Amino acid sequence: SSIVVAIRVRPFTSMEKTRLVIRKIVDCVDDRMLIFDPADRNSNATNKFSSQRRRHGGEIKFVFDKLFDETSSQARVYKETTSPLLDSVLDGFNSTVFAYGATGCGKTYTVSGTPSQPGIIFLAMEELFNKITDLKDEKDFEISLSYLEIYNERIRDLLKPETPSKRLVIREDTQNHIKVANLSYHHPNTVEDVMDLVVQGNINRTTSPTEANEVSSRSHAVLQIHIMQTNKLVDLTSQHTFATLSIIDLAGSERAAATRNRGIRLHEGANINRSLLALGNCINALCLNDGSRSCHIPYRDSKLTRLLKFSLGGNCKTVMIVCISPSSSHYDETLNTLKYANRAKE
């Protein structure tokens, strides 16, 4: 039913440690309790009297469902939040995993990271596969994998770009079955091959060649696990249902206008922000209309919102994930995306 908002940061490195003269803007003071630093005691003005400032002088309190920080390992952050989403998939309805942030804020790293650590996809398969081999003696497992990229409002076959985007059509059933046209579907034979396909996908993703993040994915992607288990026993109720798990990825969004934002950078940047808007529209409509009686949700704003037509909105559960920067170089971006998450929460 209700969604869960969870949050975590990259870290600060020698690039931030070298910058001794700076005040942090992120301070998680407790579980689920984020304080936006630092107020305003600046030596670049006055502020030596009873404050008449709007917020430059106070601190902004953000409260979430599961706020984490650099202290908490992704091995727990992920499972704490998604271990039930994976179980939710097998409770008669589907589920899905979200992400959020500006370019360079740890998407790509947090989904996996350096090839020796756990992450969203790795732990998804690690946990599931263990459950599969433990429960292999009870149920039959027919699980398939769907791969997808969104770039310039175009759906691309993440693993085989050789197929034209015209061959990918996003539909859904009245049974909430995922109806996507000709796509290179695969199976989770082992996490090694799964992750190899994920890497192949990440290679195929169309990226930025501009900013310091120049690997900079610059495209959305969705990896969907379609689980069709069946019964090994014969009885009056032997009708095992199916369900899926969507792994949602985003391009990343820079400040409204970058210093070299020209041509295709403007074009895709718009397409990214429009896609993010579409999500915001659907999420806000969903939550507010869950508070109300009638739920008209604008799933036609983006192909992603069509893709998430039921993954985000049906009788199901999901976790919102937001990547946070403690640097004042991301002051506006981080603050605004924090407010976004809070609005999504409510």
């Binding site: 008449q52 400032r53 709007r54 917020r55 969004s253 400040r255 409204a256 206008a257 934002n261 403007l266 940047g269 718009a270 922000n273 429009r274 993010l276 808007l277 915001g280 529209n281 506006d332 971006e333 603050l335 605004n336 995306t337 407010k339 976004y340």
Partner: protein, 427 residues
């Protein structure tokens, strides 16, 4: 003692047309610049003095009207900056994708003017809140200009999104986004309501059918009294920074209302007998406010009265004493006084082909008040409503304008409103 004028979109340009017409009339300057003043016109050895002005429009249209119409010979071609594709009522496009493509040129032209200008006092920007080429571009420019000239005075004469009626439906957005730039970078801003003016035209000028032509002429006439008036050498030459000294009590509150109290028809010019007290009294009547605001529901923070033509200080002082005696209008309790006086010797400017009949004296009022703050509440409601539905939001998101920026813009506006509340209440 010199200054630079800036005009954006269509409105800023059309208003500029009226202003530069007035200045020509005042100095006897012809349409080709020929004189048969140096603070508005760069001295030319041939006698063809040229306006210290920058004209910007991302769709040359209105500038082409200037280029092909009268005073195409007056203005320098280098000053007539135009784009190819307009911002189209989108602050974000004017702020970024479109505006940024010419802002470099604009700043370069300004630099040239500033390098020519010796004693630069400051700038005078004419813009709106409706269009993006006015609203968004100005936001961009003011930031850039502020960086280059942190020590120079920046005046902004804006056309306030009228509360009753407007022409674009996405104005609230462009207006609220502008606010946090103007409040940040400007030194003094003016807000003018077209509808309040049209009402003035009906009541005072007796005009049943008023348009931008006459409306702009009134606005320009005010600016002449604010600025050019000083440059004619009067009894009390109140500096532009001297205005700020006395009008502005805080780091913020840069929102004076500019009224003109000799508004009069040709018929009335015969029957009506005006004088210092009569005209001065008229400017405190909630009718010639030039904005949808009723002073009687707030307090006066400061009030500069600028006189032209046949006036004497004795009568001015007496009129003010009468006002303070009247006590109908309220003043800020912790502001002992709030009256300042500027006085010219040169008469009021007359526009051949205008309506504002010739008078022997004139009064302008530059007043800071807490009453005007109420106008922003009306805008807040308009914004909040459309914002709640995210109506038209995709036009700004399509640029890349962060949704959170809209919420931030509101909070800054709300802060401004709060400040005025505190001014009136505290003592």
């Amino acid at each position: 003692r010199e200054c630079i004028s800036i005009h954006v979109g269509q409105a800023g340009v059309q208003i500029g047309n009226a202003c530069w017409e007035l200045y020509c009339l005042e100095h006897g300057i012809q349409p080709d610049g020929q004189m048969p003043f140096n603070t508005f016109f760069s001295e030319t050895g041939a006698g063809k003095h040229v306006p210290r002005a920058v004209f910007v429009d991302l769709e040359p249209t209105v500038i082409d009207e200037v280029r092909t119409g009268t005073y195409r010979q007056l203005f320098h071609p280098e000053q007539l900056i135009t784009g190819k594709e307009d911002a189209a009522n989108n602050y974000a496009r004017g702020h970024y994708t479109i505006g940024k493509e010419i802002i470099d040129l604009v700043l370069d032209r300004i630099r040239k003017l500033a390098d020519q200008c010796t004693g630069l006092q400051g700038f005078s920007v004419f813009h709106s809140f409706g269009g993006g080429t006015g609203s968004g571009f100005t936001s961009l420019l003011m930031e850039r200009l502020s960086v280059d000239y942190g020590k120079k005075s920046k005046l902004e004469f804006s056309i306030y999104p009228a509360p009753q009626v407007s022409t674009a439906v996405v104005e609230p957005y462009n207006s609220i986004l502008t606010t946090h730039t103007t409040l940040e970078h400007s030194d003094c801003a003016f807000m003018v309501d077209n509808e309040a003016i049209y009402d003035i035209c009906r009541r005072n000028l007796d005009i049943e059918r008023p348009t931008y032509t006459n409306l702009n002429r009134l606005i320009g006439q005010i600016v002449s009294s604010i600025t050019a008036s000083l440059r004619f050498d009067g009894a009390l030459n109140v500096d532009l920074t001297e205005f700020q000294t006395n009008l502005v009590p805080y780091p913020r509150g840069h929102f004076p209302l500019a009224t003109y109290a000799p508004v009069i028809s040709a018929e009335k010019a015969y029957h009506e007998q005006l004088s210092v007290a009569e005209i001065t009294n008229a400017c405190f009547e909630p009718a010639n406010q030039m904005v949808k605001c009723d002073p009687r529901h707030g307090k006066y923070m400061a009030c500069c009265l600028l006189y032209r033509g046949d006036v004497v200080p004795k009568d001015v002082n007496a009129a003010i004493a009468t006002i303070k005696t009247k006590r109908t209008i309220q003043f800020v309790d912790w502001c002992p006084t709030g009256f300042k006086v500027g006085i010219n010797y040169e008469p009021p400017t007359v526009v051949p082909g205008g309506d504002l009949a010739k008078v022997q004296r004139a009064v302008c009022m530059l007043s800071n008040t807490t009453a005007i703050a109420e106008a922003w509440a009306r805008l807040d409601h308009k914004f909040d409503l459309m914002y709640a539905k995210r109506a038209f939001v995709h036009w700004y998101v399509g640029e890349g304008m962060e949704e959170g920026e809209f919420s931030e813009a509101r909070e800054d506006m709300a802060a401004l409103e709060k400040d005025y509340e505190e001014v009136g209440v505290d003592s």
